[model samples]
Each structure stands twice: as C-alpha cells, then as structure tokens.
Target: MTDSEKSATIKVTDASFATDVLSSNKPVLVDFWATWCGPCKMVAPVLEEIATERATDLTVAKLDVDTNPETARNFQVVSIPTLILFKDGQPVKRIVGAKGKAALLRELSDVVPNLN
Candidate 1:
C-alpha cells in the first residue's frame, strides 16, 4: 500500500514491543486493546488521527492484548483501551478508557508539544 493508504499507527506484537516502543527515539504512545472491546473500537479513529497529525512528534502503536499478553502483563494493563506514553524507555503518561480527540489531546498537551 502507498504511504497515504497505510495506517499511521504501528502494529506492535509481543516480540516487537521493545524495539517498537521502548527503544524508539521519539515518545511512543501505545494502545492496549482487544478485538472484542467496543471501547477500543471507539478510540481507534482518534488514535489514527493523532498518529497522522503528530507523526513527527510521536510514535503511535497499537498492541492487541489478546495476542500480546506478555507485554500487557508486564505493564499491568488490566483494562482495554489503555494508552501509555513511553519516553526514554519508561512509561511517563497513561490514559484509560475511550476518549474523544479533544479529550485525548487535552490530556497529552503537556507532554506532547504543539498539540493544539
């Protein structure tokens, strides 16, 4: 697929989690979700927008909790649609539940520059 047609968010699996998120130079936003979660579906588009708009500022990644259970357990993510922002290989911010684009931007404004 062309760059425009491709999804902005990166799909991270159990094995690729470390390289895709923790080791990245940019701050990585990780979405922990499962296919069966309605809330997860709700936040997908919002995340996609962020991923596209903030391409230079942040790295957005989606991880299926069902398939990547190891990463979820390591992070102690008990909820679906948990968003974790990792910088310098550590989780610096977290947002849980489905949220609108405005709400998500508001929550991340301080950490992510030029979010407005």
Candidate 2:
C-alpha cells in the first residue's frame, strides 16, 4: 500500500493523546524521538517496515519530544529513540536506543510472537 493508504502513524498532542494512544483499539508503537537524534533517523525505516507489514495488528506513530514536550513528559520519556508499545490502549513495554531491523523484530517478537 502507499503511504497515504498505510495504517501506521498519527499526530498526537497532549490533549489528543488519551484518545490516540490510550483509547485506540489496536496496539500502538509510539516512537519518541527528535529530528536531531541520529539514531532515531537510522531506525526510522525499520519502524516503517514493522508498521506497514503489521498494519492489521498495530499502529506505529511518532511523537517528537522536542516539539511535543507535554506528551513526552506525560510518558516520562527521558531519552530519544524511546519506543513505547501499547496493547489495548495501555503501554505494555518499551525499547530504547538504536536497533537494526532484525534486532527490533526480535524484540517485538517477545511481545508479539507472530512477527516471524
């Protein structure tokens, strides 16, 4: 599917975060990052592939800590490239730092085993 047809990604402000992240029916992978974070840039494609390939099972979204401080603050995000995965609108776990596609898929498999 094209980017416009892709199921991942949503823009969330603090006000809309509750509905966007906490109330959504699907699992949500929220990437807390900054444009200046080199690692975040490196793993962006990995996130996109995960999102696109698992579109039916999850939602992959990005929240810039630099621009949306309140949203990041509410989640207590202290670092860039912090990824929070939510299942049934509640955060189940997190993965931090830079990870390649394989490593990330392995990490995701623990929470979601069907990625293979």
Supply every candidate's count of residue pairs whose N, Cα or C atoms clash at under 3 angstroms.
Answer: 0, 0
Report how far residue 72 has shifted in candidate 1, in Å.
1.2
lDDT of 2 by residue, 31-72 (tens): 888878899999887887888776676778888888788887
Give the clashing pairs for model 1.
Answer: none
Model 2 global lDDT (CA atoms, 0 to 1): 0.81
Q: Ten residues in a row with the worst lDDT in model 1?
A: 107-116
lDDT of 1: 0.85
Residue 64, candidate 2: Cα error in Å is: 1.0
lDDT of 1 by residue, 1-116 (tens): 35665578889988888887888877889999987999999999888888888777788899999888888888888578899999877888888899899998877676666765
The TM-score values for the models, in the order shown, are 0.89, 0.86
